[PDB]
């Protein structure tokens, strides 16, 4: 199997927003470089919460809230520096935070 | 009550022999959800039975399931100042299961040094109609011949019946005006 050269990771709470933001980065990479791949789905995280539904008592009725978190990876097999230059330059989003740092 | 007709599950042949009549037996042999043990108890019992008579491993199991089978049941549905009992002839799915329950109900008290032996002894016995659940049969049919007396809030039901194209006589059965 392959070894990970570099990690670009996209983190969002809205599922349609991330699918669109990776597809546009992927477009920018084929237009501004030569060595791209189609976006890896990567498994989604979900945090579980429980709270009351009344101010006081009523044990039976309760409430459950969810918050979902979506992860896309792209995994461009080689970004040209000119690809990385366009990525960080055309950023403007709020539903997603794009990560270009490595670790 | 109940608006429309509602269905029943269907058991799909077990993973270690390929029988529906065995996959339903192992389902009542289950204690603490553990059918995958109840399988291990059936096949280890069945093989001990198989030394006792070699013509089939299922010999003494298959005839137990005919001989201790109740054919009749007694039902209960309170009326006012009275509880009563009202007999019904029982449907085959519960004829079969009562007998499966009773073979295993008797086995878990047999005290033998392995459960595969406990279940194998009570089957060799209930096959010949000598065992523990011949009595369980006997009682359940006695009640069904004895309780033919009773009807559901009877004194008014007996006119209500006679005009609903019922008989001039007390019907000893559930949920009818009698």
């Amino acid at each position: 199997m392959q070894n990970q050269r570099i990690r670009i990771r996209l983190k969002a709470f809205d599922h349609r927003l991330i699918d669109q933001a990776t597809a546009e980065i992927v477009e920018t990479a084929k237009r501004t470089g030569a060595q791209v791949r189609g976006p890896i789905p990567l498994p989604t995280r979900k945090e579980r919460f429980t709270v009351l539904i009344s101010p006081h008592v009523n044990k039976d009725a309760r409430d459950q809230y969810e918050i979902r978190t979506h992860l896309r990876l792209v995994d461009i097999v080689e970004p040209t520096e000119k690809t990385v230059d366009a990525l960080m330059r055309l950023d403007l989003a709020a539903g997603v935070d794009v990560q270009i740092s490595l670790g | 009550p109940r608006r429309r007709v509602i269905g029943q599950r269907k058991i799909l042949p077990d993973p270690k022999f390929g029988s529906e009549l065995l996959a339903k037996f192992v389902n009542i042999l289950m204690v603490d959800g553990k059918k995958s043990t109840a399988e291990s108890i059936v096949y280890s019992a069945l093989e001990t039975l198989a030394q006792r008579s070699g013509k089939s491993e299922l010999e003494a199991f298959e005839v137990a399931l005919e001989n201790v089978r109740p054919t009749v049941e007694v039902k209960s549905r309170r009326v006012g100042g009275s509880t009563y009992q009202v007999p019904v002839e029982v449907r085959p799915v519960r004829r079969n299961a009562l007998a499966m329950r009773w073979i295993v109900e008797a086995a878990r008290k047999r005290g033998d040094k392995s459960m595969a032996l406990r279940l194998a002894n009570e089957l060799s016995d209930a096959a010949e109609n000598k065992g523990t659940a011949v009595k369980k049969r006997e009682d359940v049919h006695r009640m069904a011949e004895a309780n033919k007396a009773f009807a559901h809030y009877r004194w008014l039901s007996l006119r209500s019946f006679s005009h609903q194209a019922g008989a001039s006589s007390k019907q000893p059965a559930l949920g009818y005006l009698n």
Binding site: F13, R16, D19, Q20, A23, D63, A94, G95 | -
Partner: protein, 232 residues
Amino acid sequence: GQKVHPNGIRLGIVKPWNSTWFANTKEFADNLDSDFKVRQYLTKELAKASVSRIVIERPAKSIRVTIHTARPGIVIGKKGEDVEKLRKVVADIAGVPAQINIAEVRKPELDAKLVADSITSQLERRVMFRRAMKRAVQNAMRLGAKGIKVEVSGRLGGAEIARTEWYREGRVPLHTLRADIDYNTSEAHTTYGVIGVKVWIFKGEILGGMAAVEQPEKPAAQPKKQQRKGRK
């Protein structure tokens, strides 16, 4: 007094959230509490305008306020000193420098908080309420929408008993997941204490004001998409 809150299950599809930003778990509380402080202290300044929603958004190295209004000019004030003062304090609260835009104004007469300020004014001002509930309803159905519910409480006329009253007319769905649909519960004070109106208004069962993204994954991005399938 029943039901899980009617707009709350709608928050994942065709209704926007009231705030949209992301912080990677450990800083999510620090960002949520600042997102509250900008809500609380900024609206204090625009007290004299009329406003339907407040929408706070955080890109890298920036905080963007969207505000939704009864008219476009109402927040700007004389010669932009006012809107700079708003941005001044959004920059002071937030760990970043600030942008503010006024949105496009669309159905401001049928919007959740602006229709309910119009109705709460009658009870606030201690008018007889002999005809009010009907004139509220007459004007919502005369300016638009497809159905309305109003429920008014806070001891109408000054009462020393619990005293509620209500009005529904047209179509008002409650267990619907699709389209935005506008609900507001007002809180307001008068001489005898706090009064409040619960207002559902229903504009349409299909609304395009938030809609799913233009493409699926499969047609989007690069023309030559197939892999080498090994061969480093």
